[PDB]
C-alpha cells in the first residue's frame, strides 16, 4: 500500500482519488491519502469549492517515485510534486499516519471497478499523450484541447491522442474508397493496430484513458477520442474475436461507472446507436448493450 501526503489543505476543495471523492474544508487538518493499491495507475483530482470551473488532477503510479500534494498560493492550485529524499518522505508519511491525519483509499475487497477501468492503462503511454518529460506524473484538466482539436492552440498543454479521421489518407486506400469507408477493418487492423499502436492492449489503454479524462474532468476532446476509438472497432467487419470480447467488458464497466446525471453530455447518441444497432458489431457487445438498454434507454 502506498501514500500521497499533502502538506496542508489551505482552500476548500473536493478531492478525487480514482472513482472516490471527499470534501475538505478551508484549512481543515488533512494530510493526504493512504492505503493506495500498488499495481495500478491512479488519478488524484480537484474541484475547488469556489470555482467548480476547471476540474484538474494528476495521473501517477506509486512505483515510479514518492509523490505528494502541496497547495501553491501563487498559481492557485494543488500541485503534485516528487520527493527525492526517501528518508524524508517515509519520516513524513509515518508521522502523519501516527497522528491519523490521512484518509484511507476506500476499496471494497470484492470491488474490481478500478482494475477494470484501467486494465490496459500504462503510465508510460499516458506520459506520451501528456508531454511533460521532467515530471513522472501527468497533469490534465477540463480545458485541455487535443492535437486533432488544435488542427481544427498551445502545443505544450495539449493531449496528444492518436489521430483518427475516417475521411483521411491513412484511413482510405487509393481505389478502395467505398470499401474502406464502409468497412474500416484495414484502418483498424493494419494502420492503427499493426502500424501505430502495435497491439490491442495499447489501443485499449488509450481508449480507457480517454474515457477517464472525459469522466473525471469533463474533457470534451477526450470524449471525442473515446467515441472515435469505439466507432472504429464497431465499424470494422473484421475484428479479432478476443478484442470484441474485451471491448464488451471495457465498455460495460465504463457505462456502469458513469454518473447517471452526466450521460446526457458524455454519451454520443449517434455513435452508440450505430455501434449497438447498425454496425458490423451490433451483436458482439452483449454486456454493453444490456447495461445501456437498462440504464440509458432514453439515449437509444
Amino acid at each position: 500500500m502506498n501514500t500521497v501526503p499533502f502538506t496542508s489543505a489551505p482552500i476548500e476543495v473536493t478531492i478525487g482519488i480514482d472513482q472516490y471523492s471527499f470534501n475538505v474544508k478551508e484549512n481543515q487538518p488533512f494530510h493526504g491519502i493512504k492505503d493506495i493499491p500498488i499495481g495500478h495507475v491512479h488519478v488524484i483530482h480537484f474541484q475547488h469549492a469556489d470555482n467548480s470551473s476547471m476540474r484538474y488532477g494528476y495521473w501517477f503510479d506509486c512505483r515510479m517515485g514518492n509523490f505528494y500534494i502541496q497547495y501553491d498560493p501563487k498559481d492557485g492550485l494543488y500541485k503534485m510534486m516528487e520527493e527525492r529524499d526517501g528518508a524524508k518522505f517515509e519520516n513524513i508519511v509515518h508521522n502523519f499516519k501516527e497522528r491519523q491525519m490521512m484518509v484511507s483509499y476506500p476499496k471494497i475487497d470484492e470491488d474490481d471497478t478500478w482494475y477494470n477501468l484501467t486494465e490496459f492503462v500504462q503510465m508510460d503511454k499516458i506520459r506520451k499523450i501528456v508531454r511533460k518529460d521532467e515530471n513522472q506524473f501527468s497533469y490534465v484538466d477540463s480545458s485541455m484541447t487535443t492535437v486533432q482539436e488544435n488542427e481544427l492552440s498551445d502545443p505544450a498543454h495539449s493531449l496528444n491522442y492518436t489521430v483518427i479521421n475516417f475521411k483521411s489518407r491513412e484511413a482510405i486506400r487509393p481505389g478502395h474508397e467505398m470499401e474502406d469507408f464502409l468497412d474500416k477493418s484495414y484502418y483498424l487492423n493494419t494502420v492503427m493496430l499493426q502500424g501505430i499502436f502495435k497491439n490491442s492492449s495499447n489501443y485499449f489503454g488509450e481508449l480507457q484513458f480517454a474515457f477517464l479524462n472525459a469522466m473525471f474532468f469533463g474533457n470534451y476532446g477526450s470524449s471525442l477520442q473515446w467515441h472515435a476509438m469505439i466507432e472504429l472497432i464497431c465499424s470494422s467487419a473484421t475484428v479479432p474475436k478476443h478484442m470484441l470480447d474485451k471491448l464488451d467488458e471495457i465498455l460495460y464497466y465504463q457505462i456502469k461507472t458513469l454518473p447517471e446525471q452526466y450521460s446526457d453530455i458524455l454519451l454520443n447518441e449517434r455513435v452508440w446507436n450505430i455501434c449497438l444497432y447498425s454496425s458490423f458489431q451490433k451483436n458482439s457487445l452483449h454486456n454493453t448493450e444490456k447495461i445501456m438498454e437498462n440504464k440509458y434507454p432514453e439515449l437509444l
Binding site: 475521411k167 483521411s168 489518407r169 482510405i172 474508397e177 467505398m178 469507408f181
Partner: protein, 237 residues
Amino acid sequence: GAMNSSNYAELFNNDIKLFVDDTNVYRVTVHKTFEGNVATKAINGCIFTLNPKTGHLFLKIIHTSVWAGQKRLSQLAKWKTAEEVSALVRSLPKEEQPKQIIVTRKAMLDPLEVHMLDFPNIAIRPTELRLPFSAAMSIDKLSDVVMKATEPQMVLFNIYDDWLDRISSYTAFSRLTLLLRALKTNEESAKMILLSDPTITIKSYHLWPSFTDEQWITIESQMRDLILTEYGRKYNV
C-alpha cells in the same frame, strides 16, 4: 455550406463549379417473374454533371454491365457516381478543375468527399434547392444517347444550346430549370408545348428548338401556366 435561395447568384460568378445529380444513375423497371415474384431489370443510366455558368454538360453514361454481380446497387450507385466525377476532375487541366461541387442529394456528400480527399481545395456542398435535374432524361437527345449506349461512355453537351449568345447565364439557368420543372410535372404537355409549331426546329447540334426571343417568352409563359395548373390539378385549387 448549403446552397439556397440566399446565395443563388453565386452559381453565375467566375469560380468554376459543377452541379452533380445522381438521380438517373441507377434506373430499373420492376416486373413480375414467372413464379409471380417481383424482380428488377436495370436499364442504362447517367450522371448529370453541369457547369451552370457555361452550360457544359458532362453526361457520363452508366451502362447496365456496371451492376452485374453487385449487391446493394442503390448504395453502390452513389459511390460509382463519386468515382466517375473524381476521374472527370483528374482528367481536366488544373485551371479547368471546379473549385466547388454541389450535389443535388445529401447522400452524395460522403461518397464524393472520400473520392476527392486528395483534392482538399475543392469544396463539396449540398443544396436546399429542389432542382429538377432528374427530368434530364425527358430531353429526347439525352435519353437517346443513354439508351443506345452499349458500353461506358462520356458525352459532352451544352444544355443551353446557343442561348448565351443572347442572354446571361442567370437567365439561361432560369430558363433551363423552368423547362425541366415543366417536363417533370407533366412531360406530355411540356413536350407538346415545345414541339407544337412544326416550323421551329431543333438544330442537329442543339437540344432544344430554335426559338426567337419573342417565342421563348411565349414558351416560358406556357411552361409557367402548366406548372401552376398541374399544381392545381394536384392539390385541387
